[PDB]
């Protein structure tokens, strides 16, 4: 099933579940899936399989 990613403000350092690199920045550092909690870079979103 597709994910439902929504922009998220990460309060502690957090790494992208797709590529492994840090979700760097002060705010809105990436996207969190509302249904499974996966965290991704904005630009990793299209690389993620529809396996929510
Ligand atoms: C030496 C690190 C160089 C890269 C800088 C990345 C960074 O600063 O944020 C990654 C936070 C920072 O850890 P913190 O210093 O904020 O404390 C959390 C550590 N622990 C989870 C064990 C309680 O670390 C983690 O939570 C887990 C990943 C640690 C290895 C990543 C290189
Ligand atoms: C905090 C100390 C740890 C240093 C960071 C370690 C690290 O993970 O570096 C790698 C990620 C790369 O993330 P990027 O935001 O460049 O994009 C990765 C996703 N995609 C390639 C698909 C677009 O890039 C960064 O995070 C570095 C900061 C980039 C700009 C800061 C002025
Ligand atoms: C004096 C103003 C400094 C200029 C920096 C721009 C800024 O205000 O912060 C913006 C970024 C978002 O990243 P940026 O908009 O700087 O670049 C995009 C990075 N990526 C395409 C990989 C997502 O949002 C953040 O939270 C990071 C804080 C700044 C780090 C970037 C150098
Ligand atoms: Zn999901
Ligand atoms: Zn990523």
Author numbering: 229 to 280
Please give sentences taken from the publication describing this entry:
Effector proteins translocate to available DAG pools in the membranes by using conserved homology 1 (C1) domains as DAG-sensing modules. PKCs define a central DAG-sensing node in intracellular phosphoinositide signaling pathways that regulate cell growth, differentiation, apoptosis, and motility. Herein, we report the high-resolution crystal structures of a C1 domain (C1B from PKCδ) complexed to DAG and to each of four potent PKC agonists that produce different biological readouts and that command intense therapeutic interest.
The DHPC-protein interactions involve hydrogen bonds, both direct and water-mediated, as well as hydrophobic contacts. The structure of the AJH-836, where one protein chain has a bound ligand and the other ligand-free chain interacts peripherally with DHPC, highlights the versatility of interactions that Trp252 at the “DAG-toggling” position can form with lipids. In addition to non-polar contacts with the hydrophobic lipid moieties, the Trp sidechains can engage in H-bonding, cation–π, and CH–π interactions. The structures reveal that all four ligands bind to the same C1Bδ site as DAG. AJH-836 is the only ligand of the four with no additional ligand-protein hydrogen bonds compared to DAG. In the lactone complex, a combination of the E isomer and its “sn-1” binding mode affords a favorable arrangement of bulky R1 and R2 groups within the hydrophobic rim of C1Bδ. This configuration likely constitutes the structural basis for why AJH-836 displays its marked selectivity for novel versus conventional PKC isoforms.
